[PDB]
Every structure is written in structure tokens, then in C-alpha cells.
Design a protein around this ligand. Structure first.
Ligand code: MN
Ligand code: MN
Ligand code: MN
Lengths: 314, 314, 314
């Protein structure tokens, strides 16, 4: 099976600059070369060139609506393509607004897909509920079918067609949710496991419950939108929106090791990795290194070990 | 329902100076202002003025017996007062000796109360078993009915009347217990969950078991005596008696989110927060921040989120 | 019952120098004096003097085969002795190659023994599967009966006689296994709990399953070969082969607390503690301190507390 990797030097989804360097940061650390040592076939696509929309005035509160919408449209297009050729799309981020295009492109080829969102945030603010006009904290609002027409049409998101319903998404890691966001996820009855749920059940039982919720009836393609700020900052400090008391480096991997076992992984997102936000070159190393580990785990690497089939090591 | 904050800038309960600054450290960080943003009514009572008893000679081993006893008597008086007006008392500490007055005052209005003690210590040394004459490590001995008359009358603790029995208290966090204490908690058959028990059962099951032990038969008021040294030092380093391998920031909150859910919280203690004991202004920030978080969690703030009733955010 | 500490200041099992200082580092911190405060009888045997084999040419890839083999032979001899006198052997390491002599000597007196290996590695590379000729990463290959004759005779292991079978050993902590090693442990059907398994089940349930596997039928002597690198580096940083996402200081202790409870502990290994590899004197303090704690836990010290029998503390 195919692994094609995307690259998405974007940063307008939020205020802090540096996230667009992420892709480079992940490749710098040899992400691709390591991925080729796996049982998979790896073809690096390269980094997309995002055309900057001039005079990108704010839409009410929202910032960079046109620039963001145009980048995602461009991403959804590439992702949809590769996915059409039956390959697995690994989108190396910037900010988490690129989820929009990353998932939108995926649902074109596999509309029955499901989404496992590992972030410390729900990122489900409608342009009417954000306190800041930042788009990396709204990806899901533009994707939810139940949220269609609950807010005005944002410039450049005309092409966006709500592709997933409340029933096809599950959050993991939640620890920072606004009043607005919480409302929505309580009203729409979305399935989540906030840190409190991970404490009570154990990452082990949480994976059991999410796999029987999203996969209990029909087996469908799995789209993992992972941000780095889903783990405690003590593991992923080089991020723009760290929140204390997050998933451990161990739970992080466990989540990815259990997803590889389903053989249903179809789309992946390694988002929000910001190099310039590390307080020491070390913190950067740390973050990147665990971002690479999470990835590789998604494609086979187990903590127990790996040996090549048919090779008698004795 | 009412919330009445009570400063108690005391420090004679132990050797290290700095704990009396705790109240100011917690207010400095905006504890009260944050508490008012909750569904509760907040009235700050202010910091008590503790009269220093001159020529406070030691009683055998015990130090500052008269000074300590007089402060607590003064505290038990205020707490009893506010509790008489049906309000929830939040005692912002110094040292943990103030538990004496904090609880003694509470039992005057609600004698059937129960106590959940989250510390890494049992603090149950009778003036005959301490190796150091420090009173913050004996609070419980003066409160336990079964320990009445097992040690000599300490100067200034004449007014103290044992209010709770071995059956109405539960420890969580234990990790440093002396030979004497352990003897006692084993003899009196007190219910506890030392770190080993939290490892074996999971904070989730521990709360289940403590709530069915103290609340299984009769629903009674809950008085939470929380210290900061109940969490691992990597979370609450600005304390005088840190002990490694403690409760995580996550378990800490879980304990408090489960207590809010009982709607039975009646008295609270945020003790032992020492600002001058931080090795970097950061460690102080850290400690205080998590001390504020624990508090807020006791009164509603959930990690999943919060939205105001009756407000249609759409 | 008897305790006899055995220094083994060895380091040829690997490249990085400093591990031979371990013994001294553990004694420096008062390991022995602390052990005598327990209900056990402690007799320090002293540190063994390892004779250095001249012109110790490599055997193919393997390095220092003769020097290593001669030290272990000398160790297996002392351990077998004290075990003959019905005492518990606590081997203070260097590198983990000394496991060979530590266990080999133990099986002479108690052949039906079992082994609980807590490391982040399987240390089961046959001189044909190592990528580096390092022996601390092969101890188990020389001990396994099923691995007899699967590799050439290494100079100085003539004396080694495979004493335990695949069925008598259980790993805990695994997180870094090569292709070769993983093969073997999958082929020989060895029982293990890699970090993934500890995440899924909980250290509590893991102990339950290792004790019913290796002990469910016949009760036999327990040989605990512990390595420091089995815990996350944030606890045991002063080691030569740290690997992230390991057992916590809490799980580490739980493992040792449950083993004391079996009253079946017969042999113990506190290996790989390297003083010179600490980035700050603190990191060294840290590591050593937790290495001492694990030890003491193996012989009684509980996190809940300890009181002397027959002493009425009141
Ligand atoms: Mn996000
Ligand atoms: Mn205390
Ligand atoms: Mn080892």
C-alpha cells in the first residue's frame, strides 16, 4: 500500500508565525527516509505553494478568510487526487485550519469516512462564536453537516461542502473548550473523551470505546487529524496553543499503535508543529522527534519491535 | 449557593517560613475574580490577623503550641460563623495545622460531616509520636475522637473537641508515613488510598470507592482538606514537604471534578502553598496556577467545558 | 531471612564508560545502611575485583568477549555460593551483561527459578544479530535453552550452560526492540508487556498476569533483573541507553511492591546506573535515589507505611 505525503506550509490560520516551517522541521529530522524503512511505499509529494490573496480584509471577526480558504481549496484538490489513486495521505502541517482541505479532499473519494481528532481543543468555533478571528480554531465548523447555515458564508469557503456528520467524529485529549464550543458539542451530541475521560477509563479502554462507536456497525476509512498540542507540553512544547495536563508521549503512541492495527487508516494530519516557538533547540528537537514517532507508529513501528517477514535472523 | 473565602496567613505550624504568603499568592493570581465567573456567589472575607502569643515555650517536643492553638481557635470561630449562614468556606492556607480550626469550625454547624484528606502525609502524629515538634503534621490527632486522651493536653488546645471519628475520614495520596502514624491508621482502621492504591485501581475507581465508603449510607456534607504536597512536586514544587511519586495534575483535578459532582462539598482547604520555596519564579507560577485550578474545579469548571444556562450561543 | 549485596563494577559489556561507578554511587547514597533499617539481615559482600583479560580480541562482531565472560564466571561463582547459604543476592551493577553471571549462579542453587526482566530492551541479541558487538544487549541469548547452538561459541562462555527456558521469563517495559530481537521473542513465544501492554492494561493488571503466568502452577524462586533504563529517562536519566515513554517512578515501585508481597524474591539486579552520564549532579541524584527506592521496596518498604511488629506506639 501507498504513502503519499503532502506538505502544507500554512500559517494564516492563526497569529503566531513559525508553523509553516513545520513541514521542513519534520523532513529535516528525516521523516520520509524513516518512513521508507517501513513495509510501506513512500512517495514525497513536496511542499505546496500557497498563493497569497492580496488585501485579504477580515470578514467581521475572522482573519485571513480569503487566504485560508484558497489554500485549503488547493489542498483538498491534491489530497482528493492521491486518494483517487488509492494511496494514504499524510499531510505535514502548519496550523490546524488545513484540516478543512485535508479532510474535504478525503471525503470526496471516501464519503463514508470517519474522523479521530486528537487535539486539546475541539476547534469547532463558528465565525459567530470565536473571540478571535482565528481559523485554525474552527476547522470542524466548516466540515460539520449539522452546522450548515448556522453562520454566514465566509469569503473563499464557498467551495466547502459539509462532508461529515456529528455521528462520524470522535475527540480525544480535550482540555480547553470555550463556552460556545462546549455548547455545540453538547447540543449536537458529539462523542468525545476529554482528559477527564482518559483519566477515568485509561487510554486502553478509550480506544476500545471509540473503535466500537465509529466502527461498530460499518468498517470505514479512518482519517486521523492529530495535532501536536494534544499531548502535554512536556512532550510537545514547540506549539502555539499548549495546554497543561495532556496526553502522555505513551498514550500518544498507544493511540497511533491501535489505529495502525485497524488497517483502516486512510488519511493523517501531523499539525501545529511550530519550530520557532521552542524555548531551547532541545524543546524543538523533542517536539519534532515525537511528531515523527507518532507518524511512524501509524504505519507499523511497534514499541515491542519489528522484524521483516520471511527473514530467518538465525 | 454562597462561597466565603477565608485567608489564614499562618506559618508557626512548621519551621520553613513563607507559607503565610500563600493567601496573597493565590489572590495575586486572581483566584477570587476567577471564582466569581462561576455560577456561584463569592464574598471574600479577607485575611485573618493572628495574634502572636509571647514567650510561646515548647510543650515537651511540640513547638509554638500556644500560638497555633490560638490561631485555630480564631479560625474555627469564623468558619463556624459563615457555615452558620449556609455558605461554603474556602480556607486559603498557610501550613496544614490550620486544618484543626478549619474543620473544628465546620463540625459545629455540620457534625455529621466527612473528610477527604488529599496530602502525601497522614498528619496524624500525637505530640508523643512526632520526631519534630511540628503541628502541621498532627492536625488529625487533635480531631480524631478515638485519639482522645492518648496524649497530654497541649497548651492552647483546650477548646478543641474531637469532632470526627475514624469512620468519617478518607486519605488520598499518601506516600510518606512515619512508623507511629502507620501504626495508628492501621490500629484505628482508617480508610486510605496510598499511592500504591491509586496505581493499582486508577484514580477513577478510587473516587468510586471513597464516595461509597463515606457516602454509601447517609449523604452528608463533604470537607475537602487539600494540600498542595499531595501532587507530585513536578506540579506543586513550591511546598515545604515535597515527596516524589505523587498524584498527577490530571488526577488532582479528577478528584476535584468528582467532588463537585456530589453537590455535597461544604468545606475546602487549599493549604501549604509556599511562594518563597520556589527555585524559579516559574515553579511558583506553576504551583499557584494549579492550586487555583483545583479550587475552580471544586466549584464547576470542567475540563470538557462550560456554557451558561439558557444562553443560545447560535 | 538474609541479604547479601554484591558489587559488580563492570563496564566492558558496552562502549560508554562510567557504569562501573554505579556500585559506589549506590553505596555513596547509603543503600546498605538503609537496607539494614528493614526487617532483614544485611551483609555487604563488597565489590568484586574483575581480572582484565589481555589482548581481548573481538570475536567477529562481539567486543571484549573474553573479559566479559571471565567476570560473569566469577560472579556466577559468588552468587551461587551465597545462594547456597540460603541468602538473597542483590547484585549492584554496572552494565546488564552481568545478568549472565547473576542468573547463572542463581540457577545453580534454584534451577526451577523464574525471571522478571524490567528493561526497555529485550537484550536478546545472539552474536549473529547484534549490529554492535555489545554484550550487555545479549545476556538473555546466553541463558535461553531454546537458543542453544543458534550461534557460535563465544570465547569464555564455554562455562555458560543455558539455565532457563522461554517459559520461565517475562519482560516488562519493552519499548526499543530491533528486528532480530523481535523475531526471536515472537518465534520462541516469550511472554512480555511492552509499554503498549502497560498502557492498555495498567501496571496493576500487568502484575496480576505475570504472577499467574510464571507462578500460576508451581511457586518458584523469583529473580528480578532490573535495569534502570526501564523507567522513563525523566526518572532514570543517568543511563547509557535511555528511551522515552517508559515506566513511571510510580509503576516502577508498584512492580517492586508486588514482588515483595510474593515473598518469593530470591535474586535481584540493580543494573546500568551510570553516574558520569548525568547532565547535572541532580540527574545523578535523581537516578540513584530512585534506584535505592526500588531496592528498598523489594524488601518491605511500602508507600503506605511501615511500623515495627510488637511495638505499641501509643
Ligand atoms: Mn487544533
Ligand atoms: Mn498535610
Ligand atoms: Mn538491559
Amino acid at each position: 500500500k501507498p504513502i503519499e505525503i503532502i506538505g502544507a506550509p500554512f500559517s494564516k490560520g492563526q497569529p503566531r508565525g513559525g508553523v509553516e516551517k513545520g513541514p521542513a522541521a519534520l523532513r529535516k529530522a528525516g521523516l520520509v527516509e524513516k518512513l521508507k524503512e517501513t513495509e510501506y511505499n513512500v512517495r514525497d509529494h513536496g511542499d505546496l505553494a500557497f498563493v497569497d490573496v492580496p488585501n485579504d480584509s477580515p470578514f467581521q471577526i475572522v482573519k485571513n478568510p480569503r487566504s485560508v480558504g484558497k489554500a485549503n481549496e488547493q489542498l483538498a484538490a491534491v489530497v482528493a487526487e492521491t486518494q483517487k489513486n488509492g494511496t494514504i495521505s499524510v499531510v505535514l502541517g502548519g496550523d490546524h485550519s488545513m484540516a478543512i482541505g485535508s479532510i474535504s479532499g478525503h471525503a470526496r473519494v471516501h464519503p463514508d469516512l470517519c474522523v479521530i481528532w486528537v487535539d486539546a481543543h475541539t476547534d469547532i468555533n463558528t465565525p459567530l462564536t470565536t473571540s478571535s478571528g482565528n481559523l485554525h480554531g474552527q476547522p470542524v465548523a466548516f466540515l460539520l453537516k449539522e452546522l450548515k447555515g448556522k453562520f454566514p458564508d465566509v469569503p473563499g469557503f464557498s467551495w466547502v461542502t459539509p462532508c461529515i456528520s456529528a455521528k462520524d467524529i470522535v475527540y480525544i485529549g480535550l482540555r480547553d473548550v470555550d463556552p460556545g464550543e462546549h455548547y455545540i458539542i453538547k447540543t449536537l451530541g458529539i462523542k468525545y473523551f476529554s482528559m477527564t475521560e482518559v483519566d477515568k477509563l485509561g487510554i486502553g479502554k478509550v480506544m476500545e470505546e471509540t473503535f466500537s462507536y465509529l466502527l461498530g456497525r460499518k468498517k470505514r476509512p479512518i482519517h486521523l487529524s492529530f495535532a501536536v498540542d494534544g499531548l502535554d507540553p512536556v512532550f510537545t512544547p514547540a506549539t502555539g496553543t499548549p495546554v497543561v495536563g495532556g496526553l502522555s508521549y505513551r498514550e500518544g503512541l498507544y493511540i497511533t499503535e491501535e489505529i495502525y492495527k485497524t488497517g483502516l487508516l486512510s488519511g493523517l494530519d501531523i499539525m501545529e508543529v511550530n519550530p520557532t516557538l521552542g524555548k531551547t533547540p532541545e524543546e524543538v528537537t523533542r517536539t519534532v522527534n515525537t511528531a515523527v514517532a507518532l507518524t511512524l507508529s501509524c504505519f507499523g513501528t511497534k514499541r515491542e519491535g519489528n522484524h521483516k517477514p520471511e527473514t530467518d535472523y538465525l
